[PDB]
Amino acid sequence: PSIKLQSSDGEIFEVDVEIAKQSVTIKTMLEDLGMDPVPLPNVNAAILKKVIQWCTHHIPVWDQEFLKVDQGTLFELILAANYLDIKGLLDVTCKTVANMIKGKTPEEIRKTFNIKNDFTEEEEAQVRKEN
Amino acid sequence: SPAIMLQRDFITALPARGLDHIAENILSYLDAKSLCAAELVCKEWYRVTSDGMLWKKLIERMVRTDSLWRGLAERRGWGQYLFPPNSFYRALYPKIIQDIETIESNWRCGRHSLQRIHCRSETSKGVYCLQYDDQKIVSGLRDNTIKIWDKNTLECKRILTGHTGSVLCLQYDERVIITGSSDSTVRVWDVNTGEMLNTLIHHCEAVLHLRFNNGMMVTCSKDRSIAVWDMASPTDITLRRVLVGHRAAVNVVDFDDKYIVSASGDRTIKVWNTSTCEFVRTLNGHKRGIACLQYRDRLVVSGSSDNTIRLWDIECGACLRVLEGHEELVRCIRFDNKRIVSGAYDGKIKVWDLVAALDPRAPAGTLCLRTLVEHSGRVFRLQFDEFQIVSSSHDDTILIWD
Amino acid sequence: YLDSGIHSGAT
């Protein structure tokens, strides 16, 4: 085979079928709707690349570094993973945000993701109370 | 693609994008002292954990795995609420921790309950094998009968019958009790009733041990042999083959997808390929005969006339660790995630720290967690779990330790 | 009596 999925951008990435078919989302648009090019209005050209560059290659080894990129593009992958329904890619990109919360303190978590503290003293106290 | 900051606070970001389950899925990988953290990061972070029943969800992942957690859920109520405010959940977590801490505590010094079951009869004074449950005990007496005890008020549910010798070994299943006896036979009994299904001739001396599971049975005898049967039904059962290599009685046999392990009074544990029924190794090293194994994944634990418990790696066949402390013959023994429980001739049962034992840094003397002494005669068999040992012995008693 | 269910070595 060989279908052309078409990013939000116009840009036409070419992939073998089955490289894609792991997106149940791209799957359906062939397997159910007989759609010629696969239009991804929710994924970017830049983003498409990085997910095809994952769906080719298929506690990570190779992924640990594939995902050492900034939140705003990590995030971006999480929803794209979710949009193209790629069970793995959504799992290991969440795992990653988890690994970044894991390990001590609400203050460290903030610093990690920014995030001002909303709670008054009271609200802070009756959370520390169910400690 | 790659142009948007430390920016994203994912878990406040995602719900705001329609997509809650994702933020919940992300939090759900967290341990409690850390879900506590997320809880306290900020108000919305707080909210995602409350609206996603992230305690419920984290306590239901506990149960779905750690043996102990499935347990306390089944027993004493609270598992009642699983599978409703969310705080009930968070508030309960510390108590389930404190539980596990008090069990694993008093259970390493003294958590007794015994509940003596005295069985009776002419002839014997021995319960050889026993197999155990949430509401019954299947026991092979020496009187020649299998006696089935109600687990609660301990009364006798069914006296099964029709065996020439003492019932030496047995296996539950959810269909058929199977026993091996002094009479050289193996039996099939419907577990609901007491009805004999099939009875296999084949051996020619006491069937000493059988182990059973899935489509095939493994069996062994005073006659020095092992027989491997693939069973198609209680009604069917065919001899696949016979394994000859032991030089004396095969006291114990056991079983998993990749190996069949036997042991005899020839002082060896032999390891057979579960599929080709070929020799692979000998585990040589006990100074005297082996009275008992268990074998799970990687591990094989044996009890000997030489009075030691040995711990083996099934693959290289090395001994990992020698356990001394039993002052007499070790007749029966069982692993588990965290422990080894063994039964000796002087009716004493010893509890060993399995995880300590598997690490050579741990010194000999402190491997035996407190040692339990409530039997008049020989300890023939035990099977335990997260919160219970339940033992046979000569002095015709079943004991149920807490 | 040893056990009917265990036997040491040789014969």
Side-chain angles (χ1 to χ4, degrees), chain A residues 5-102:
Chain A
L5 31 74
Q6 179 203 48
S7 72
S8 69
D9 265 311
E11 195 168 347
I12 329 89
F13 288 81
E14 189 181 296
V15 337
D16 299 52
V17 112
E18 286 274 300
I19 280 173
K21 291 258 229 246
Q22 35 188 291
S23 153
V24 332
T25 300
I26 310 269
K27 196 176 166 82
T28 321
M29 275 172 268
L30 313 170
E31 228 123 306
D32 296 67
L33 277 85
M35 293 193 66
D36 316 74
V38 192
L40 315 176
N42 279 34
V43 315
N44 206 336
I47 281 272
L48 224 214
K49 186 205 185 105
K50 216 101 266 163
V51 359
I52 327 257
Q53 205 248 131
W54 183 100
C55 291
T56 55
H57 184 76
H58 287 77
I59 302 160
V61 303
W62 189 84
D63 286 49
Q64 199 105 48
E65 20 121 295
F66 171 76
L67 308 177
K68 277 226 296 295
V69 204
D70 58 317
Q71 334 262 68
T73 67
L74 175 42
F75 193 79
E76 265 302 339
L77 301 144
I78 277 169
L79 40 147
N82 179 73
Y83 180 77
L84 315 153
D85 190 0
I86 324 256
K87 261 94 198 60
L89 214 216
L90 184 59
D91 290 350
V92 319
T93 54
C94 287
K95 285 167 159 71
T96 293
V97 193
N99 298 346
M100 290 175 45
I101 302 194
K102 188 77 164 152

Side-chain angles (χ1 to χ4, degrees), chain B residues 14 95 155 162 173-174 188 209 254-255 263 269 300 309 331 333 388:
Chain B
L14 294 168
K95 296 202 201 112
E155 286 166 17
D173 197 84
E174 304 298 276
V188 186
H209 213 246
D254 198 10
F255 205 31
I269 311 158
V300 36
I309 278 148
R331 216 286 183 153
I333 199 158
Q388 213 143 64

Side-chain angles (χ1 to χ4, degrees), chain B residues 224-361:
Chain B
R224 292 164 200 214
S225 79
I226 299 132
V228 168
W229 317 76
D230 13 36
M231 296 163 147
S233 276
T235 314
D236 229 357
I237 313 167
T238 313
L239 190 83
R240 187 192 293 153
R241 219 175 49 261
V242 277
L243 325 191
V244 171
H246 278 301
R247 281 158 147 274
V250 177
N251 301 309
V252 209
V253 87
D254 198 10
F255 205 31
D256 98 345
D257 283 21
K258 60 195 164 33
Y259 287 123
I260 286 181
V261 317
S262 58
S264 35
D266 80 345
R267 306 161 180 185
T268 87
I269 311 158
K270 289 163 183 302
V271 179
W272 318 82
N273 195 135
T274 356
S275 318
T276 20
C277 296
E278 37 145 11
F279 222 103
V280 294
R281 265 150 210 299
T282 339
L283 310 200
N284 71 317
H286 272 285
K287 287 214 264 71
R288 279 268 226 130
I290 293 105
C292 45
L293 293 200
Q294 196 200 308
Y295 158 75
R296 193 139 73 76
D297 334 299
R298 231 204 18 74
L299 191 74
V300 36
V301 155
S302 36
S304 168
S305 311
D306 74 42
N307 291 18
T308 78
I309 278 148
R310 259 160 172 261
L311 286 71
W312 318 80
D313 164 71
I314 192 66
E315 311 287 357
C316 61
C319 181
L320 307 172
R321 149 74 69 233
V322 183
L323 284 181
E324 290 225 274
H326 268 297
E327 274 263 282
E328 215 94 15
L329 172 322
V330 180
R331 216 286 183 153
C332 56
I333 199 158
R334 300 225 86 240
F335 293 18
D336 129 304
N337 299 71
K338 3 209 189 260
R339 281 177 291 251
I340 305 178
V341 173
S342 55
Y345 258 21
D346 49 31
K348 295 175 183 147
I349 283 157
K350 291 175 98 40
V351 192
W352 313 72
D353 190 316
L354 171 65
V355 189
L358 286 162
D359 152 80
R361 295 266 149 173

Side-chain angles (χ1 to χ4, degrees), chain B residues 33-46:
Chain B
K33 312 174 175 207
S34 211
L35 170 59
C36 269
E39 219 178 43
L40 202 27
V41 174
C42 68
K43 196 31 208 87
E44 175 74 347
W45 273 56
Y46 183 93

